[PDB]
Design an enzyme around this catalytic site. Structure first.
Site, PDB file in Angstrom:
ATOM      1  N   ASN B 369     -15.902  41.957  -3.565  1.00 33.23           N
ATOM      2  CA  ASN B 369     -15.906  42.088  -5.111  1.00 33.23           C
ATOM      3  C   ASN B 369     -16.686  43.309  -5.506  1.00 33.23           C
ATOM      4  OD1 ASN B 369     -18.360  40.594  -4.585  1.00 33.23           O
ATOM      5  ND2 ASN B 369     -18.455  40.825  -6.684  1.00 33.23           N
ATOM      6  N   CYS B 371     -19.100  43.497  -6.863  1.00 36.50           N
ATOM      7  CA  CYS B 371     -20.788  43.695  -6.540  1.00 36.50           C
ATOM      8  C   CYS B 371     -21.107  43.289  -5.039  1.00 36.50           C
ATOM      9  CB  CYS B 371     -21.355  42.242  -7.262  1.00 36.50           C
ATOM     10  SG  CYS B 371     -21.399  42.925  -9.167  1.00 36.50           S
ATOM     11  N   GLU B 373     -20.606  40.944  -3.244  1.00 41.25           N
ATOM     12  CA  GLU B 373     -21.299  39.582  -2.931  1.00 41.25           C
ATOM     13  C   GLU B 373     -20.273  38.665  -2.579  1.00 41.25           C
ATOM     14  OE1 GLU B 373     -20.887  39.014  -7.822  1.00 41.25           O
ATOM     15  OE2 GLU B 373     -20.614  37.475  -6.068  1.00 41.25           O
TER      16      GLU B 373
END
Lengths: 682, 682
Positions: B369, B371, B373
């Site tokens: 994604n 980020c 994560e």
């Protein structure tokens, strides 16, 4: 002497008396066939074996032959090759073999000749009907009829593109619709392309969203998105149309300025603008132009900006406090308009009141196609959140073909000539199923719109010693189109009987009530001129008469019509060279046209019927000028139910005012739309 | 003295002894409440009337209250306001009132206070269950649990955005899929955004199309298209991931170079790269990198590039003559990599073999994604020509929340603390129905993936006098995550019993066979340190034991698990200020963080538990350096089934080699992915 290029080039030389040496072009054809076509064409022991081989090795589509008795197929081919067809110009031959006829998969030999391609086309369109097929073959070989390239090029082939390649879509003011548009643009472009989008319904830059007071990036971001779509799917091209009275009009035009910014910069997409009657009146009396918010208009009338009559409700709208209104200067609008056209050739103009006032079909016309020739009604679509259609609206698509006027006048049975083309184009629509865009498909299924066009008008007029633009020309043009029209509505009427069904919405149309015919039941019918009177006379053609209209009017009010739309005059690109016609009913762009193609970089093309003894009859469009051109299209615009691609040719010295005056004249004279502004050449 | 800004500013001054004057921040809170919060908050005669008014005037959603007895609702609110909650920092208070709490429609008064917002959140998540609701309230007010902003911000409101705002989509190698992606990007972005696309399956620039030998514009044009999508729908943001061994890798990275061209220029989209193990080995031994054609790979294995194991089949693939292979220099790859990161902070790195090797779920993981994560499996979708889904695949979405480690250690009943958060996040997934993207919805429905994260690790360690990065820290980190994990799988196991259903595919998973637990049935469990041993001791927390794992392993093999994925450690943005935590398990970026917000342009934020008597325990991430940071995340990576956002902080003097060495170390140590490369500041 077997350099065909050099021979062709000879057309680019004048002798001390300013004469050309036209025979050299024929020599170039001959040397072409002898040194290139023949030596690289594939010839079989017989037709039977050929059709066998070509189907087996994956070139021809057996599915098309399977609708006929093999014997019939073999006969038709033979009839074809016995017609004694000849290419009239080196370019025609060269263009056909280099980009139309079928070649081997490795691109080294030819599997087809003109009559062959023609035959397959006939076979495909006629779809089982032997008579029709035969008629198609004759019409095509005589040079009378000539279908649009996407048809002439793919019919019968196993590896083919679509037959229809001209689409007009709406966009609704919401993300679902926008998302679909992008998608439709991908899907369509990815095969033929030729797609236009209406942007008039989109909310303006600044309008609210979800109750938040100032959020709307406008239409530009939407354009950038289409622009990229088109770019990615490499082939196809796009256009956008915007109403003149739309709040983003100025920034919309600003995208086509060299000097503006990076995200206000649409290089590929073509622009078109819809301009109603008032904006002309406003500019006349130097007033201000009121731009209405499509956002407000929707909430306050339940209809999108593009489904209402701005001119009719111009005042009502200004008085309504609920509709936000921004202002700009009418005259300044037309000013920047001409300036942009001046540099890019665009925009196109669609004279919204003129068009709707002529439109016999129930509903309004809010956009146009990539060539500004198509004009039909459309209807919105409604989508579910997951992008599934909730209600399938009706968008527009159309297939085209046009018939060489000269050759038509050289044959007494015009009625057959028209009926056949109409039947053939109709078959194109019937066979069309563009499932990737339901609205397009639905639309075609409900209307069966086709576009039968004309070409070789200048070539014809010249031959018969009539100067382009003259009163005789204007008189022919009018009567000729008067005629074609008759035979078409007649043909479409007939079709409605045979298939036992009419185009959707017929009942609410003008054809149903009979109003369509009022025009043809009043006089200005017969010849203003005497020469013209004799042309139809010498031809055997019979100008339709009051009784014939009265009759058709009854057959139509009773049985209906098959096609929602029949005529349309687009520009004939390359098919015109193979057919040897002057590109549409507009004067020639040159005596010896020059194209940048091939090993030589140049290929020359002399106009039809032009010889060193009548050059004075072949004056270019630049010389003829816009007035005479406009005047011509006007006579035609009276009959063509759809529209015609009209390009003005201006000298390089011309000014925006010059341009603007041409446009006003056009508007004033009834023109439904305008295409480019071609300023002078290189 | 009632300027709260100036007071806050006081945190930016040092006395001759380099000390701060922390009390001034408290004063700033106080003056804030007195001069601003109170005077502009709306207070009612009673709760009953308030809930009445707010529902009536369109602020609160009665639908949420209607699942409880009004009396219960009134009680919970009261319990809330009686907890004695206090904001610890001016920024926390300021951030909450300026952008989280509910205001009047005209934006001039406040309708909510912390406990209020909390309550509504609890009410929404607990969806009828009073106990749960109450537990949610306690957990949130104690500072123990703190849901992700999109949840904490919208729950209970009438005008709300979605609760889930983090999506990962696949793109398949065909126009339908591409068209959908653009659309999904529009739909998602248009509300929260946070969308990432996998590009690895797309055919490379040059690959054939429709048998035509060289036509494929590659991935760039596809990126430009997403980029414009995101831009148009103004809010949301996008990322693209590309496999390192993909033929367009270099031009893919080149888009983020200041100095390259205009149509190789993606300014907004974030880049991420997937890098398998070999490409490391290849670079080690200075070899060449083989880039395989996704086009060929598909036709020859029936699977897209992104569904196969490059590393496993690296040789097999090189030997196969059917797969076109282009080459570049491994070391040069990592070189340009570091150079780009160096200037932009990107790309992200997803260590494909490390991740799949840890992935307990059947299938492969090919992207991440926005980020870096999230790490889950996905599956393709198949579309009809009209863009209708033919087979709905499974894409990824996830909601997040994390719990303040310190506060957790300050409470003996950790099991309850974990069970509650998990229950709450689970409710977030259950209530999610993103119908505009069927795959997203389908996916959520089949997996119930959630992401429970951690924060305040540095803050905690500091308080207890442990230096970040030290062996004690490394020992806590490991055991703490060892624990949380236990209680989560336990909770999810339980859920599976209560709802009588497990996540789709459980049977093929590792949880089903029991392999997931092998790791926890072997020793390196107990404390390397003595201090750590005592921390859990003083806390009352009980480190899970062999018997407890053995037990859970049987309850799991039998009853199953509800959630396909449980943990994930994203960066805690602003919610961390209101919760007063150090942003995740990474050292503080400063002692007194400075944010550019408000009338003053600056707002200062002191770290948790930091006083002038322990500053030496609060060293910034720059000082701590990447080694210690990486080392920490590694201990955690052993347990977190999904992934953690890891940003390295380098000095401004650092070099690409420095960067590259940090990355290798990371890879070597087990890190599943990397986020930014934050070079020094302004």
């Amino acid at each position: 002497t077997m350099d065909y290029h050099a021979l062709n080039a000879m057309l680019n030389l004048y002798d001390k008396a300013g004469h050309i040496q036209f025979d050299k072009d024929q020599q170039a054809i001959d040397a072409f066939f002898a040194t290139h076509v023949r030596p690289h064409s594939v010839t079989f022991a017989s037709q039977h074996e050929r059709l066998g081989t070509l189907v087996r090795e994956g070139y021809y589509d057996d599915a098309v032959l399977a609708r006929y008795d093999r014997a019939f197929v073999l006969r038709l081919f033979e009839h074809a090759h016995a017609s004694g067809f000849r290419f009239q110009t080196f370019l025609g031959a060269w263009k056909f073999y280099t980009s139309y006829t079928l070649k081997t998969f490795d691109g080294k030999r030819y599997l087809e000749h003109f009559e062959d391609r023609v035959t397959m086309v006939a076979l495909t369109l006629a779809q089982g009907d032997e008579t029709l097929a035969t008629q198609l073959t004759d019409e095509m070989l005589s040079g009378r009829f000539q279908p649009a390239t996407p048809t002439f090029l793919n019919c019968g082939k196993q590896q083919r593109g679509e037959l229809v390649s001209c689409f007009l879509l709406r966009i609704e003011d919401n993300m679902e619709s926008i998302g679909r548009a992008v998608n439709s643009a991908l899907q369509l472009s990815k095969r033929g392309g030729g797609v236009a989008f209406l942007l008039s319904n989109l909310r303006e830059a600044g309008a609210p969203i979800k109750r938040i007071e100032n959020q709307s990036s406008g239409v530009i971001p939407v354009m950038k998105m289409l622009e990229d779509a088109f770019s990615y799917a490499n082939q196809g091209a796009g256009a956008v149309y915007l109403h003149a009275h739309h709040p983003d009009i100025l920034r919309f035009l600003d995208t086509k300025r060299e000097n503006a910014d990076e995200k206000i910069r649409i290089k590929t997409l073509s622009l078109g603008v819809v301009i109603p009657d008032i904006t002309f009146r406003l500019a006349k009396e130097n007033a201000q132009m009121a731009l209405f918010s499509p956002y407000d208009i929707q909430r306050r009338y339940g209809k999108p900006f593009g489904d209402i009559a701005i001119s009719e409700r111009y005042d009502e709208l200004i008085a309504d406090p609920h509709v936000r209104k921004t202002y700009i200067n009418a005259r300044d609008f037309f000013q920047t308009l001409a300036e942009i056209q001046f540099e890019s050739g665009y925009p196109y103009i669609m004279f919204e009141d003129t068009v709707n006032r002529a439109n016999p079909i129930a509903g309004r016309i809010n956009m146009s196609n990539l060539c500004s020739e198509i004009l039909q009604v459309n209807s919105a679509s409604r989508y579910d959140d997951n992008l599934d259609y909730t209600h399938i609206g009706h968008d527009i698509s159309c297939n085209l073909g046009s018939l060489n006027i000269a050759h038509v006048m050289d044959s007494p049975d015009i009625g057959r000539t028209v009926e056949t083309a109409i039947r053939g184009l109709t078959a194109v629509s019937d066979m069309s199923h563009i499932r990737s865009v339901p609205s397009i498909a639905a639309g075609n299924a409900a209307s069966h719109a086709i576009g039968l066009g004309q070409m070789n008008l200048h070539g014809y007029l010249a031959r018969e010693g009539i100067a382009y633009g003259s009163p005789e020309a204007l008189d022919f043009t009018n009567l000729y189109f008067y005629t074609i029209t008759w035979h078409a509505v007649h043909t479409s009427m007939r079709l409605a009987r045979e298939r036992g069904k009419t185009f959707a919405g017929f009942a609410q149309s003008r054809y149903a009530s009979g109003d369509y015919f009022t025009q043809y039941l009043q006089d200005d019918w017969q010849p203003k001129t005497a020469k013209v009177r004799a042309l139809f006379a010498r031809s055997g053609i019979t100008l339709p008469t009051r009784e014939m209209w009265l009759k058709l009017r009854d057959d139509v009010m009773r049985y209906g019509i098959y096609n929602q739309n029949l005529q349309a005059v687009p520009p004939t690109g390359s098919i015109s060279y193979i057919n040897h016609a002057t590109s549409s009913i507009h004067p020639i762009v040159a005596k010896i046209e020059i194209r940048k193609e091939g090993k030589t970089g140049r290929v020359y093309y002399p106009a039809p019927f032009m010889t060193n003894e009548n050059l004075d009859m072949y004056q270019d469009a630049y010389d003829i000028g816009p007035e005479k051109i406009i005047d011509t299209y006007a006579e035609a615009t009276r009959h063509v139910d759809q529209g015609l691609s009209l390009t003005l040719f201006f000298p390089d010295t011309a000014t925006t005012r010059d341009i603007n005056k041409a446009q006003i004249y056009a508007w004033r004279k009834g023109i439904k739309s305008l295409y480019y502004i071609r300023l002078r050449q290189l």
